[PDB]
Design a protein around this nucleic acid. Structure first.
Ligand SMILES: Nc1ncnc2c1ncn2[C@@H]1O[C@H](COP(=O)(O)OP(=O)(O)O)[C@@H](O)[C@H]1O
Ligand SMILES: Nc1ncnc2c1ncn2[C@@H]1O[C@H](COP(=O)(O)OP(=O)(O)O)[C@@H](O)[C@H]1O
Ligand SMILES: [Mg+2]
Ligand SMILES: [Mg+2]
Ligand SMILES: [Mn+2]
Ligand SMILES: [Mn+2]
Ligand SMILES: [Mn+2]
Lengths: 356, 448, 381, 448
DNA sequence: CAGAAGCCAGACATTAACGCTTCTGGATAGCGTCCAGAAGCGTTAATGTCTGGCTTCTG
């Protein structure tokens, strides 16, 4: 039995005063076409469908159109609640979504039917376990997963249905507290999200990272932009497959001196390709931002490229400095001592977290 | 963002409909122009149509609405003002209008009708005030607040930026550039501190509100208990009834006092722990944070005022080399004047002459306009009266610097009364005052 | 054929920081029960489904629950766009509501559609016209005038209605099917819509007026009105929802259905004694859901500390006071004083008498105030 | 109040013992003169010198004291400004000076030295700053807030009086023509009302601080008494005291509840009695004022404003027949212009043109100065700027009006960059720069 | 060098900047509901002003 795995869609993300409508729609259409071609049994997503708790209108339209197109396929879709994503906006359509042959999410394991309606496998729906819902928290999440696995085993009994586990968390041994990797319940396949970078973990295919299907940042613009296919054979794992995704908005990163980068922009000399290439600029010179931007605009206005941000690799503009750095600069006039500064920085982190 | 047209009717003192287009045989080049005429002949009204039709607020009248519409000329029942402007290679169109009751010279007013539209496609993008005033700001990159001190130095308000309050200046800088996250942090830390202080209170009041017996009364009750205890052993039935009755009165008093005392000790432990909590927020609220985001915003805007003054010095060197602005080490951010001729003399901006203060304010406004250049380009500036206070040679140097600036895309318009300057300026939108009727007229090529 | 005529739901509206979720859910379940009882086939709401452009989450949950519950009966639902709501917020669910046999017609240019009956036979022909934003039907033109815009917009909307009515008639052809048309505009301060310019359709559903009433005395143009009161000017009035009987392509009759008042409201006018007397009448009954009350004080005396006196008067009863008002509008000034008087030779007693003469008190508190000011003046001598 | 002499040292651009006296022939010929020169030469400085000598403050600097002193010329030791003025029939002398740490070009600033004395009498009327201020205010009849907008009209703030909020506008009219008791009685009334209200609030706190037993608790306690008493009559020694002890516990609680109610009942009776009085105190406060004359001060000063505008009307008709002024039907102290040519327009001063606003402000200042001619007569006037905005066809009429005023004993000294009056005014105090050295000088006849 | 004018270090009456509280006009209305703006009073650290100890120049 076949499953498509994806996570960190992050619809409605304003990428530096830009939009993602066209690339989101293209990726969704590609996903539908691939699902229809491969005759996949069901679709799973590991949370973080929306950027924030109040996504823009077009994100809702994209998600609804995706679901409507999925209806004609007849497959099964399960949606989890992400970390930044609030469950309030997901629970709104829960009643309609169930009527439209898809499930959204404390819950009980559910049997996943095949295309003909026969029971194919069982999944473990676990949304983002909020600390209010549940050292102590590590044991809480561990034995919560243990209880869910016990419930799934009780539901299975002697049935040949493979067990699938879902979750939205980070684990040890992964790179961009942490649930230990070895503490996983003995399930056939466990799906993880919350990390846009797909990577190997645990040495066994029972736990795999799908990552994000779209570039959330220039740092993650690498080739590892895959979507995982998991296949099953008579109740046992068959193989794991990875899918290359198309790109409708290439990302380019530039670094070096002004002369070197100006030479680099000559590669895109009036190519006139239909997707405008978005540029990330990293200049090592000491020239001020307010006029180095004018210097860059003195050349980019003719090329078929668009400039997103300018960064100096190391007076200075507020865009160069972060909130934590400026707050630390504010603390230079006060006596940090030993604990006062620790308490103040912890409280400032709490305030910046509770602001959004 | 540059202005491509204008239209008005009965605006302030201009009866009939008038329209000027900056795409005709005059104004063919981007050269600076001027408007001249008798004083009080609607000279600023031509500069009021742009501001009214863009931001629903003249530089003089605070607001125009169903009430207190003092702008309209007398003996008229309708007015309107339309602007066509261009930005990023595309043109738009703003509008404003208002009528009276039954088109009569008397009676109540109607709600003004507005419009924002694109001149190419012909569709309209806004039809309500509360949305149009925000969409225009988002599109042009500047709202009324940034407009009135970045591209329209009205008469008497030329030195507004220099003498503005530090909170106003910090708000202007943060609104022009940067993200308001500093403001939200500052305005929210204070709210958290207020909540913590309020919940800390009403617990001390509850602790102090419960009456406790003093230790002397506790011993006095205890002494009476043992005093009543001894003679009952020495004892009759009626005497026993009254004696033990008084024993119960003391026992319940001691019982309730201990219970009341126990509750107070519970409150003290919470308050003593809470006193450790309150310092978490008190120091933070003292260092940063306040209502409406004042302290943290003012601290943060120094790093961008440094850039602004760095740009202002470069702009002013070619305009007036006697002075170089500087950012003095002040808690309330201010610009500091450095004197080149006086061997790096340093003194406050408030002690400057009118002409030099005008020059400093103009340089600062120009640098502020050019600071947002990388995001959006502003290619218009209408400086009003106040430019004529300069001396002839200084005025000549200022005009030469403005001409040098005009080599760029800025279409500077200058409104003043200098005879030499008006002779020098090629284009003049002359206004003709009437012979005592109180109205004013334009040239016959503009009326329609 | 039976159809429900309602509008101005205004879901998620905040009324003096009080939510309307309870009464909205009560009306939704009552409407569903009435639909089940009367065996309806299609339901039309004539706009203002959402109070704001971005309604809160619970309003969306209420709407989703209502549509899910209506799916059980199998009846058709038509959702009209208002002016307060968001066309995008309606279109984000218009695409998916099609699978539920419900239609959202927020976007302009919607073609007429056939309303099927419960038996599957064609029942009627829709003319689902939402609120016509000027940005979707007209084009901006220069050289305009102050009042020319209103006439141009009126001509454009009249032409749109004429064209849509003609298209609907030619689509229905010759079958005797009733023609239904929606509307979210006011109909006859010189901004209105003439009554006679509506096309001669079988029945016209008009909204955006919270008071249910008939326009121009013509029987097939009706204002549904609000389902629940939305302000204190309709607290004492009963809201209505219309059902329409259709057969053989012609209208037969309509009947008004009273809406239960789950949250009663009332308004008070008068001086302190009258307000207290009217407020104390609630001591007998006990309202488990608190009753919302308005106070409109019309008097001339000070009433020191209104916000505390009213709270004390209402503390002993479950009557939630929401707002107060007083006849505070008053101007004060020294008159011309014959253009000759000057403050130097004028007396403080005279200026005090002039100040008090503007007030309506005559002797009762006048003597006490005069004595009080004499005492105040005597401490500076 | 006419100034007799001026003497300054190291003030702004000027450097070194510049003394001018109007007793000489050129100034005593007519009393009217003009001042000209390049911008920043010291035209405003030589007019601000008298303001400093009189009120220890300048229109451009908030204050001068032992700190933040910068009015002295850069790199100098001592700066002083001394003037002589004649009030009534006798001339006085005012003196101000300031020294550095050790007369070095740098170091700490010392405390200012002030001396107010009678000319040719040798009597030091005052030797301290505050006493000097009080004495000069009493004798001249002009505080700074009255002088800076009745006798001297500095540039930029000439329209301040027309644009002043009533809070600061009413104080000037209160200070003039006596009658200072209104603000005093208003403040005292507010203070006593605040006292009589805060006394009642504490009684409410005591009212809600008394614990009262609920009727259910009262009946339950009373019911237990019957149970304890009935079980007693059913009779051993052990249960005698057992019921009796509980009997005493209940009796005190009922007694305490009665005592708690007894204290409350008396206090509620007291609260009711003084409640009726504080109601009238608040009612009186609602129409007599609070704190610094918030209300009823404008009510008292409305008549003075009416007299002032009545005089300003007759003076402005002589000046030019364009507008008339009268008080508008608003609660705030406002004056609105009447359009003579339209004969019906009633518009507020906010919509006036710049030149007309300047003329209205000058007319108001002249009428205000002439209003107090009865006590502490004023016979001088200075105008830093304002004539620039006027055209030649109206500036001539303005100069004719000033000449008509100067025909009397009043002396008027104007400053203008416009060359249209260089021949109208015979006397000119030429001021010159020096080769861009950063300093300035003037005619050698006034040097010392 | 002895002593006086000048310079440097302490308490007290104003004062200007938030902050709270109340009141009100504008954007919507078949002339109604909040949202934002303004005015006025209360707090408080900051500051100018008056008063008491060291130090260089005149006799
Ligand atoms: N309410 C009004 N009705 C008619 N005309 C008015 C009204 N208010 C002002 N005006 C006219 O509008 C003119 C505007 O002056 P303006 O020439 O713009 O000023 P400036 O001379 O400072 O440039 C006034 O001088 C007056 O003639
Ligand atoms: N400490 C200082 N050092 C040098 N120049 C100074 C100093 N203080 C003031 N100035 C100069 O004094 C001049 C005063 O000019 P002002 O009389 O105000 O001119 P105007 O009459 O044109 O208004 C200015 O040029 C100012 O820069
Ligand atoms: Mg002007
Ligand atoms: Mg000057
Ligand atoms: Mn993610
Ligand atoms: Mn997440
Ligand atoms: Mn409505």
């Amino acid at each position: 039995m076949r499953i498509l795995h994806t996570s960190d869609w992050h619809l409605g993300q304003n990428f530096y005063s830009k939009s993602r409508e066209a690339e989101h729609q293209a990726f969704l259409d590609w996903l539908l076409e691939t699902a229809q071609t491969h005759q996949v049994d069901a679709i799973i997503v590991a949370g973080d469908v929306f950027d924030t708790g109040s996504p823009p209108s077009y994100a809702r339209t994209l998600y609804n159109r995706f679901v409507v197109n999925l209806q004609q396929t007849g497959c099964h879709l399960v949606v989890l609640a992400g970390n930044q994503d609030s469950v309030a906006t997901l629970n709104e359509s829960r009643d309609i979504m169930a009527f439209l042959n898809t499930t959204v999410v404390g819950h009980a394991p559910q049997i996943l039917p095949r295309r003909d309606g026969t029971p194919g496998a069982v999944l473990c729906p676990i949304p983002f376990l909020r600390p209010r819902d549940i050292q102590h928290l590590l044991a809480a999440i561990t034995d919560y997963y243990q209880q869910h696995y016990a419930d799934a085993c009780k539901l299975r009994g002697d049935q040949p249905l493979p067990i699938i586990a879902t979750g939205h968390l980070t684990t040890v041994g992964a790179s961009k507290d942490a649930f230990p990797a070895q503490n996983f319940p003995p399930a056939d396949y466990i799906a993880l999200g919350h990390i846009h970078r797909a990577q190997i973990i645990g040495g066994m295919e029972h736990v795999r990272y799908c990552g994000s299907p779209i570039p959330l940042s220039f740092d993650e613009c690498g080739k590892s932009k895959y979507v995982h296919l998991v296949t099953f054979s008579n109740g046992k794992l068959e193989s794991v497959e990875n899918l290359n995704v198309p790109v409708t908005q290439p990302m380019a990163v530039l670094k070096g001196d002004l002369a070197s980068i100006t030479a680099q922009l000559e590669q895109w000399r009036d190519v006139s390709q239909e997707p405008p290439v978005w540029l990330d600029i990293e200049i090592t010179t000491d020239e001020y931002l307010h006029d180095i931007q004018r210097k860059i605009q003195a050349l980019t206005e003719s090329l078929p490229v668009e400039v997103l941000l300018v960064r100096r690799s190391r007076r200075e503009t507020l865009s160069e400095l972060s909130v934590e750095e400026v707050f630390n600069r504010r603390l230079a006039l006060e006596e940090l001592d030993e604990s006062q500064q620790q308490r103040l920085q912890h409280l400032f982190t709490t305030t910046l977290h509770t602001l959004a | 963002m540059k202005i491509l047209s204008l239209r008005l009717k009965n605006l302030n003192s201009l009866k009939g409909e008038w329209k000027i287009d900056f795409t005709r045989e005059p104004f063919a080049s981007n050269g600076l122009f001027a408007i001249t005429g008798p004083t009080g002949a609607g000279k600023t009204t031509l500069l009021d149509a742009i501001c009214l039709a863009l931001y629903h607020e003249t530089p003089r009248l605070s607001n125009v609405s169903q009430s207190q519409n003092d702008l309209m000329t007398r003996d008229t029942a309708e007015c309107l003002a339309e602007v066509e402007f261009e930005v990023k290679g595309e043109a738009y169109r703003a509008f404003w209008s208002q009528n009276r009751a039954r088109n009569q010279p008397d009676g109540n007013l109607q709600v003004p009708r507005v419009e924002l539209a694109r001149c190419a496609d012909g569709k309209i993008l806004a039809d309500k005030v509360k949305d149009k005033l925000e969409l225009t700001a988002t599109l042009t990159g500047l709202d009324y607040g940034r407009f009135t001190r970045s591209m329209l130095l009205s008469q008497g308000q030329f030195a507004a930026f220099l003498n503005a309050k530090p909170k106003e200046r910090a708000e202007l800088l943060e609104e022009l550039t940067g993200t308001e996250i500093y403001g939200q942090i500052s305005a929210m830390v204070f709210e958290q501190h207020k909540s913590a202080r309020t919940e800390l209170e009403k617990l001390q009041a509850q602790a102090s509100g419960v009456t406790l017996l003093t230790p002397e009364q506790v011993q006095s009750l205890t002494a009476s208990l043992q005093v009543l205890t001894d003679e009952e052993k020495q004892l009759t039935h009626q005497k026993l009834r009254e004696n033990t009755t008084s024993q119960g009165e003391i026992r319940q008093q001691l019982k309730q006092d201990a219970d009341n005392r126990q509750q107070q000790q519970t409150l003290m432990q919470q308050i003593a722990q809470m006193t450790q909590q309150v310092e978490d927020w008190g120091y933070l609220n003292s260092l940063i944070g306040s209502k409406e985001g004042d302290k943290f915003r003012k601290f943060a805007q120094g790093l961008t005022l440094d850039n602004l003054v760095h740009l202002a010095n470069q702009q002013l060197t070619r305009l007036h080399g006697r002075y170089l602005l500087q950012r003095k080490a002040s808690e309330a951010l201010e610009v500091e004047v450095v004197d080149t001729w006086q061997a790096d003399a340093v003194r406050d901006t408030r002690t400057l002459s009118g002409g030099e203060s005008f020059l400093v304010s103009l340089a600062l406004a120009l640098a502020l306009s050019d600071l947002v250049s990388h995001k959006t380009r502003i290619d218009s500036l209408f400086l009003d009266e106040g430019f004529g206070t300069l001396d002839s040679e200084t005025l000549d140097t200022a005009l030469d610097a403005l001409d040098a600036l005009n080599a760029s895309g800025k279409t500077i318009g200058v409104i003043s009364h200098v005879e030499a300057m008006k002779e020098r300026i090629p284009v003049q939108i002359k206004v003709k005052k009437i012979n005592g009727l109180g109205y004013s007229k334009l040239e016959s090529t503009f009326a329609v």
